[PDB]
Symmetry: D2
Subunit: 291 residues, 4 copies
C-alpha cells in the first residue's frame, strides 16, 4: 500500500465537505482571516518521497505544534534529567504540552537574547523540515502578542512560584514568534517523518535528534497532543499527532510516515475539524493505528 496521490485528492474533497460545520480561530485576529475551506495534506515516506493534495502552497503557522519542536530542542541542549525536573511527564510539574508547561520549556531555550533564542529554534526547524527558508509570520506574531492576556497571566504565575525568572515581555516575544513559525504541509510532513525515523534525516540518515528525544516527543503526541481530546483521537485515529489552533496537525507514524495537515476550520474543541476527518479516513484505509 503506497499512498496514491489521486487517492489523497479524493480524501481531501470528502473532508472539505465538513468545513461548513467548523470555524476558524477568532481569538487571535490574524488567524480569523484564514479560509475555513482550505485543506492540505502531505505524506512523507522513508524512501524520502512525498505525496500531497489540496491547498499545499499555503503557509500556515505552527501554533501549539511548535511546543513539540521546542521540547525536542530543549531536551537536546539540557538533557532529559534537567527537563523533567522543570516540567512533567504526565497528561507536580506542568505538562510541556499545556500552555503553562510550554512557556517553561520556551524559557529554557538557550541564547542571550530573544533573537538568538529564536534563531536557535529556527535553525533547528529548518533542519527537521529540510527547508532553509522557513521563517515566522510577523503579522500573526504581532496579533498574538497584542492580545495574549492569559499567557501573560501564566508567565507572572510562573514567576511568582519561582519556576522561571525571565522578563515576561521578552518570554512572550519569544513564545509568540515560536507559535508564528509558518510552513506548508509538505514541510510539516517531513518533520513528522524525522520523528517517525527516530530522529534520523530521511535524506542523509544523520541523527537530527537523539532516538530517546524522538521517542519522548512521540509519547506526548499520543498522551496529550490533541488539545483536550487526545483520548478520543487515539480511539478514532490512533497515531501520534500534535494539533494547533491555526488548523495544523503534525503526525509521526512510527517507522512508516510523517503526515502534515492544515485545515483552518476547527471543531468545538479547537482541533482542525476538516483535518481530523481526513486523518480518520486515512487511518482506517491505510491501517495507520499503532494500537
Amino acid at each position: 500500500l503506497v499512498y496514491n496521490q489521486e487517492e489523497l485528492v479524493r480524501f481531501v474533497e470528502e473532508a472539505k465537505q465538513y468545513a461548513r460545520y467548523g470555524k476558524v480561530a477568532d481569538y487571535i485576529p490574524a488567524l480569523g482571516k484564514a479560509n475555513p475551506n482550505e485543506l492540505s495534506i502531505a505524506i512523507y515516506t522513508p524512501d524520502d518521497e512525498v505525496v500531497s493534495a489540496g491547498d499545499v502552497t499555503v503557509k500556515v503557522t505552527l501554533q501549539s505544534i511548535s511546543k513539540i519542536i521546542a521540547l525536542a530542542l530543549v531536551l537536546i541542549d539540557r538533557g532529559e534529567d534537567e527537563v523533567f525536573h522543570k516540567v512533567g511527564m504526565e497528561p507536580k510539574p506542568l505538562n510541556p504540552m499545556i500552555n503553562a508547561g510550554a512557556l517553561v520549556v520556551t524559557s529554557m531555550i538557550q541564547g542571550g537574547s530573544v533573537s538568538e533564542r529564536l534563531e536557535r529554534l529556527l535553525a533547528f526547524v529548518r533542519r527537521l523540515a529540510g527547508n532553509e527558508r522557513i521563517s515566522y509570520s510577523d503579522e500573526v506574531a504581532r496579533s498574538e502578542f497584542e492580545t495574549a492576556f492569559l499567557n501573560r497571566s501564566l508567565c507572572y504565575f510562573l514567576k511568582q512560584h519561582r519556576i522561571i525568572d525571565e522578563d515576561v515581555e521578552e518570554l512572550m516575544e519569544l513564545y509568540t514568534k515560536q507559535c508564528a513559525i509558518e510552513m506548508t504541509c509538505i514541510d510539516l510532513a517531513r518533520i513528522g517523518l524525522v520523528l517517525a525515523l527516530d530522529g534520523r534525516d530521511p535524506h542523509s540518515s544523520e541523527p537530527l535528534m537523539p532516538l530517546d528525544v524522538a521517542r519522548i516527543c512521540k509519547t506526548f503526541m499520543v498522551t496529550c497532543g490533541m488539545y483536550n481530546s487526545s483520548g478520543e483521537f487515539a480511539i478514532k485515529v490512533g497515531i501520534p499527532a500534535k494539533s494547533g489552533v491555526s488548523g495544523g496537525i503534525l503526525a509521526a507514524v512510527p517507522g512508516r510516515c510523517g503526515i502534515g495537515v492544515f485545515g483552518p476550520a476547527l471543531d468545538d474543541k479547537g482541533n482542525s475539524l476538516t483535518g481530523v476527518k481526513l486523518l480518520e479516513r486515512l487511518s482506517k484505509t491505510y491501517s495507520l493505528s499503532i494500537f
Copy 2:
C-alpha cells in the same frame, strides 16, 4: 528465550527491597514482596514463563479493563462514552470504573459477577478462574473511599444502584485472581485485536480491543502512565496487588505479578523487568 527470562527475573528481584506491598487492604499486606512472575504469550499460541508462576494474584485495577470491554460489547461504544469519558469520568479511575461496573447486565450481584467471570474465563482460556473470597471480604469491610464515590455518583444521578450491591460486585470484580500465565493469555487476545489464539474466534470485536489498548497507553499505569510510555513504551495496565497486564499489538501478551510496589503504586520489581524486556526485544510502539 526461557533461560534468559529466568535471568531477567533474578535481576529484577534485586529491587524488591526498595518496594513495599499494598497494606491498605489487609489481605494484600500479606503478600511476599520478594515474589515475581512473568509469562509471555506469543501468536503461535505458545507461552514462556519464569519466577513464582504458581502464585494466583488478584487483578485489582487490571479488572477495570475487562469490565470496560464487557460493557462495550454489551452496550456499544455509543452508550458507554455517554456515561464515562475518553480522556486521561474516565473508566480507569475509581469513580469511572464504578460507573462501568454498575453497567454490567444481570439481575443480581451473582448474575452480574458471572457475566464478568465467564468473559474472563474465555479471554484467559481457563474455565477454572474465580475470585479470592478472602481478598473480596477484606476489601468490602474497609472500602470507605469507594463507598464515598458510590454515594457521590448516586447523589448526582450518574448511577441508580444500591451502593452495597454495587460494592459487592466491584470488590468481587477486583478480587478475580489468576496466575501470570492466564494474565498473559488475556494480553495476547488484546494484542491480536480480540482474536482467540487457538481457534481464531473473535472473543471481542476489533474496535473493543483497540479501545482497551488506548486506555492502557494513556492512563493504565496508575499516575505514571506518561513515564511508563517513555521508559517501556507498551500498552499496560497495573494494579496494587502487583499485577501488570501488557498487550504488545500484533506481538505478545505479557502478564507480570510482583507485589512490591514503588511509591507511585505500580510493581517496582515488575516495571524493572518490563524495562529490561522492552529494551532487549524492542517492544516500544513509539
Copy 3:
C-alpha cells in the same frame, strides 16, 4: 414591638411567596405551604409577640447545627471541638455539612436513641417547651435520600476524622435536622443566645457565655448558606437558616427571633422570611 405592626409586616412579606419555592429535594419538605409565614420576637423581659401562622410546627434542618454545636462544646470542650473542625468561613467549620457531621458524631451516649435524647433534652430546655420532638416523616424522607451526606461520612471515615458506623451517624443526623417546633419556641432559643446563654424566665445559665458567643459568630460569618455577606448588609444580625424555611436570629442583648417561611429563594434561604427580617431590621434598627 407592636403586635398589629407585626401582622402588617407579615402580610407585606407574604407578597413575595409566589417568587419562591419550597424545597422538594427532601420529598416530605415539598409538602409544605409556600404561602405560610410566622414570626415570633422574644424580649429580655421574657415576653413574646408573634404573627402569621404561629401554630405550624416546622423542622429546624440546618438550624439544628447550631444547637448540636452548643451541646458538643459544653460536653467535649472548645479545645477538642476545634481540633476536629475549623473556625473559618479537616472540615472548615461546624456550619458546612462535613463539619456538622463531625459535630453530630461527637454527641455522647451508647445508642442513637440516647445521643438523640441528650440533644432533645437540651433543645427542650433552650426552648422552654418540654414537648419538643422530631418529625418522623421528615427524618425518614431525609434518611432515604441523603446521598451527599453519606458520601461525606465515608470520606471522613477514610481520613480518620470520624470512626462511627455511617448508618448510625445518619440516623442521628436526620433526626436532629427533623426536630420541629413553632416560631415561638425558636424565638426563645434565639433569646437564650442573645442573653449570652441565660434562661429568660429564671435567669440561670442554659449554656456558658463563651458557647453562646461562639454560635453567634458562626451565625454572622456563615449562617445563611451562600449569602451570609448579603444578609449582614441587608439585615445585619446573627441568624441561621434552614431549607424548611426557618430563620433563627439572636440580636445580642436585645431579642430572639424565629421565622418560618417555607418559600425559599434561589440561594436556599426563606425568601418571605428574609424580606420580613429586612423590614424588621430597618424599623427597629437591629443591625449590629
Copy 4:
C-alpha cells in the same frame, strides 16, 4: 480607657514579638522592627489615648476598605456589586481578596494614575483628619518590582473582560494605594469615622454615607483578618481589617476607633503582637459585638 493601663497592655503584648516574623516578601517591609507596637483608641468625644511606638506604617490590605468606600460613594452600590462579590465564600468573590481589590481600585475615577491617587489620598486625609498623609515611595517601589501574583490576577481579569485598564497603570495605582502610611493615631481616627457610621467626630458632617460605613464594617467581620476572621470574631469580636505591615484597623460600632501597628506577624499574616493586644483590650472593655 486610661492611658497607663494601655502602656501595660502594650508591654504585655510585646513579649510575643519573639514568636512573630516581619513580612519579608516585599523586601522593604523586611526592614521593619518586630519589637514595635503602637495603639491608639479614638472615642466619640473626639479624644484619643495612645501607647507604644507612635511611628508611620503602610496600610497594605487596610487600604482595600478605604478604596471600597471611595468607589461605593463614586460609582454606587449596584455597579460595585455588579463587578465584585459580597461573599465570604470569573467574578471576584468580594472586595477584600486581592482579585476583588484590584477590580475595586480599577474603578477609581480620574484621567491620570496620579489623579486617581490624589482622589484616594484626599479621601484618606479627610477620614483620618490629617492632611499630611502621603505614601511611602520606597514601599510602593519594592511592591511594584516584586508583585507577580497581582499582575497574574490583572491579566486573568483582563482576559475575562472584568477590567480594561493597562496592567502596569493599574499596578502603579494599586501599589501606591497600599503604600499610604500613617501612625496608629490617624488610623484609629479612620476607625472612629466607621464606628460613628461615617460621621466626622469633630465636625459631625458625613464623610461617607451610613450605608457605605455599614458595608465596610460587614466585610471587616466576615473577611477582614484574611484567613483568620472566624478566630478573630471568637477571641476579639469586633470589625477589624489587617495588613502584612502589621496594621489592624478596628471600628467598634457606636464606641471607638482603634488603630494598631505591630510588624511581627503570626503565620496567617496578621499582627501577632497586635492581635494579643486586642484580645486583652476586648476582654477588659467588653468590646465584642456578639
